Amino acid sequence: MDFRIGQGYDVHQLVPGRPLIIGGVTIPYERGLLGHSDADVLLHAITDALFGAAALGDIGRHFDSRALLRECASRVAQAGFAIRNVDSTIIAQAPKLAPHIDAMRANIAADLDLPLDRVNVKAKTNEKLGYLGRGEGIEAQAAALVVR
Amino acid sequence: MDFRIGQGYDVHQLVPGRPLIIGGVTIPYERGLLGHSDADVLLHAITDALFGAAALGDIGRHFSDTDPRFKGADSRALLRECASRVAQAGFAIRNVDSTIIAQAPKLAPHIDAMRANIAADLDLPLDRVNVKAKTNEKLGYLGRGEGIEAQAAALVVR
Amino acid sequence: MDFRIGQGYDVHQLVPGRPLIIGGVTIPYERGLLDADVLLHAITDALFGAAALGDIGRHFSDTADSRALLRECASRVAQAGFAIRNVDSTIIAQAPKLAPHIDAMRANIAADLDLPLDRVNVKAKTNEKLGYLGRGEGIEAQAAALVVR
Numbered sequence: 290m291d292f293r294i295g296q297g298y299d300v301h302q303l304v305p306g307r308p309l310i311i312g313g314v315t316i317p318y319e320r321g322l323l324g325h326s327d328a329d330v331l332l333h334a335i336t337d338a339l340f341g342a343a344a345l346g347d348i349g350r351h352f353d354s355r356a357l358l359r360e361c362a363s364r365v366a367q368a369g370f371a372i373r374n375v376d377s378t379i380i381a382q383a384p385k386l387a388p389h390i391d392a393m394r395a396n397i398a399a400d401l402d403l404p405l406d407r408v409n410v411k412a413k414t415n416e417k418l419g420y421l422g423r424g425e426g427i428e429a430q431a432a433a434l435v436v437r
Numbered sequence: 438m439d440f441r442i443g444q445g446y447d448v449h450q451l452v453p454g455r456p457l458i459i460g461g462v463t464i465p466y467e468r469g470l471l472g473h474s475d476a477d478v479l480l481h482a483i484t485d486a487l488f489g490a491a492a493l494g495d496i497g498r499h500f501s502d503t504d505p506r507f508k509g510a511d512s513r514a515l516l517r518e519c520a521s522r523v524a525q526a527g528f529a530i531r532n533v534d535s536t537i538i539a540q541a542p543k544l545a546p547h548i549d550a551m552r553a554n555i556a557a558d559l560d561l562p563l564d565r566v567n568v569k570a571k572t573n574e575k576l577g578y579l580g581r582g583e584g585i586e587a588q589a590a591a592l593v594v595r
Numbered sequence: 596m597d598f599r600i601g602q603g604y605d606v607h608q609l610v611p612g613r614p615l616i617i618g619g620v621t622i623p624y625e626r627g628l629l630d631a632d633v634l635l636h637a638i639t640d641a642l643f644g645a646a647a648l649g650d651i652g653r654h655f656s657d658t659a660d661s662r663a664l665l666r667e668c669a670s671r672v673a674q675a676g677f678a679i680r681n682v683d684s685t686i687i688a689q690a691p692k693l694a695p696h697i698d699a700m701r702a703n704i705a706a707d708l709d710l711p712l713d714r715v716n717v718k719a720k721t722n723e724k725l726g727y728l729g730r731g732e733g734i735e736a737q738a739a740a741l742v743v744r
């Protein structure tokens with residue numbers, strides 16, 4: 290049928306005195322992500338991928354990050370699209386994200402009204418390269434498939 | 438239902454004395470993108486996603502950067518030729534999505550025009566083409582405005 | 596029907612002293628990746644991602660070369676109920692020239708995934724002398740995969 294794909298990218302600086310919140314999960318860490326919102330880099334990337342797949346523009350032209358993700362899903366449905374799946378990658382040199390992946394997936398699935406088997410989150414370091422490798426920021430990438 | 442996906446990446450240095458042309462739009466700006474062609478980073482990314490979805494290789498294979506015939510080339514002409522070869526290979530384009538990442542200038546005012554150019558070149562309606570603009574949150578060579586990056590995704594069907 | 600998309604990313608440092616293996620192909624160069632097959636890793640991640648099976652680190656704990664890992668990945672994706680429809684990818688390396696080796700990489704990947712050659716694509720890019728990629732300090736790979744349940 291009328292399938293569409295979307296792709297999303299986000300990055301935020303890591304700064305002192307902020308909670309680290311990724312995929313809705315508060316992760317123990319001495320620094321957190323800097324932004325106007327709670328700076329949830331993963332949710333932002335997914336949001337952009339979903340807007341992209343529905344050809345609805347981007348997060349900047351539309352607008353915590355879970356409320357924003359829920360609103361994104363609403364606007365995607367309003368345009369006549371159903372979400373089929375989401376995949377994503379977080380790139381962070383530190384801290385370890387593996388123990389938190391399942392909770393992120395559950396959060397995203399709940400926000401998008403999707404079963405768990407249609408949401409994926411993957412974790413990577415940057416092999417100590419560049420600003421990500423120096424722990425100056427955290428990047429997220431996302432892909433979304435929808436159908437009209 | 439023989440769907441295929443493709444993805445594209447491009448980056449170019451931002452330098453004085455070149456036109457800034459992104460998504461086919463000439464943007465008023467003191468610097469422009471450096472390349473053999475008009476260096477349209479967004480159109481190149483989309484071109485690569487389309488060739489990739491059709492398993493036809495990449496922009497270098499089809500349009501050589503060492504070939505003088507492409508010096509200052511209009512990247513919309515390249516995108517249209519790509520679309521023609523994708524069609525010849527038996528594929529129809531279903532949608533395109535993309536991201537441009539730049540510290541400056543502001544791209545929001547130009548996005549609709551880029552979308553319209555890409556839609557024209559691909560013979561798509563506007564509602565199957567998307568362009569997203571952002572900054573790199575001050576990080577890295579993108580944060581320092583040394584270059585501009587584009588990412589693209591395309592869905593086709595044979 | 597029940598299509599899903601997946602995406603993958605990988606990067607490795609590029610220094611003298613190790614061989615350069617990308618897409619199962621050994622490429623002569625003064626530097627190598629710290630088998631560190633960046634392209635196969637990205638594709639593996641995209642496949643696990645499309646199947647919503649997590650990632651390469653969850654399946655294959657560092658606690659076998661990258662082609663063996665790719666083959667096992669494909670087996671798990673199949674058992675989870677998914678057929679692979681296509682793979683596309685990009686390698687970003689300032690040097691050496693990767694174009695001569697593309698068909699060899701595609702052949703290795705198609706073999707490992709039991710796919711027709713025309714459903715596997717690999718693209719090559721430089722980083723226009725920008726960043727650690729542009730300075731030849733590492734090589735990046737990006738991948739996209741489409742599957743169907």
Ligand SMILES: CCOC(=O)c1sc2nccn2c1C
Nearest residue numbers: 299325326333348349352574
């Ligand atoms: C205002 C809250 O949402 C937004 O518009 C967002 S989310 C986001 N991530 C990097 C920049 N950015 C902006 C401007």
Ligand SMILES: CCOC(=O)c1sc2nccn2c1C
Nearest residue numbers: 473474496497500501502507
């Ligand atoms: C010259 C038109 O097509 C090409 O070959 C292109 S487009 C392009 N963008 C960055 C490098 N590059 C090359 C080598």
Ligand SMILES: CCOC(=O)c1sc2nccn2c1C
Nearest residue numbers: 605606636651652655656657
């Ligand atoms: C055992 C092979 O799989 C892995 O865990 C991999 S693949 C890989 N590429 C960069 C880091 N990295 C790790 C930790």
Ligand SMILES: [Cl-]
Nearest residue numbers: 572573575580
């Ligand atoms: Cl920036």
Ligand SMILES: [K+]
Nearest residue numbers: 428446586735
């Ligand atoms: K990148």
Ligand SMILES: [Zn+2]
Nearest residue numbers: 299329330333
């Ligand atoms: Zn953000």
Ligand SMILES: [Zn+2]
Nearest residue numbers: 447477478481
């Ligand atoms: Zn280019």
Ligand SMILES: [Zn+2]
Nearest residue numbers: 605632633636
């Ligand atoms: Zn790797």
